[PDB]
Design a protein around this ligand. Structure first.
Ligand SMILES: Nc1ncnc2c1ncn2[C@@H]1O[C@H](COP(=O)(O)O)[C@@H](O)[C@H]1OP(=O)(O)O
Length: 142
């Protein structure tokens, strides 16, 4: 569906930028799932963990994703994204949207223009599964 109720998200110890947003995270997939499907989604989340923490994430610049969306790019994440995409799909879990996935960290919800830095590596602090406009049901730390 394109009305997801849950999403997987990633949180980093520090951001090499400045942000208005109350919570800085990397969205890593959105889901349309029923609570009786919470365990299965957790297992895959458990299964992907090693690669998720062996992932080399980096930022080089910031940009406007869309009108009034100011974000920072992230790279090194797409392969493990599609790997997990396959795992969800094969368990018949609705994961994905019609629109293509772009990995980003939302920095602000206002119009600002690009900043740059040397390639810098993001260190994951947490990976979680959370309901949309809702509580976090599951958390994983390294
Ligand atoms: N590929 C994309 N292209 C344009 N906008 C996107 C894209 N992916 C996400 N967004 C929008 O940027 C916002 C960043 O939110 P997040 O904290 O989850 O990263 C999303 O709410 C989304 O707003 P929208 O769904 O209205 O298009």
């Amino acid at each position: 569906a394109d009305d997801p109720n849950y999403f997987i998200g990633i949180k980093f110890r520090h951001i090499p930028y400045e942000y208005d947003v109350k919570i800085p995270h990397l969205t890593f997939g959105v889901l349309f799932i029923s609570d009786n499907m919470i365990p299965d989604v957790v297992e895959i989340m458990k299964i992907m963990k090693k690669e998720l923490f062996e992932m080399d994430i980096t930022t080089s610049y910031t940009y406007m994703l869309s009108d009034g969306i100011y974000v920072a790019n992230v790279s090194g994440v797409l392969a493990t994204y599609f790997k997990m995409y396959n795992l969800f799909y094969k368990s018949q879990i609705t994961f994905g949207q019609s629109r293509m996935f772009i990995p980003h960290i939302t920095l602000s919800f206002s119009n600002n223009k690009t900043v740059r830095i040397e390639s810098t590596r993001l260190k994951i602090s947490s990976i979680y599964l959370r309901k949309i406009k809702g509580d976090t049901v599951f958390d994983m730390s390294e």
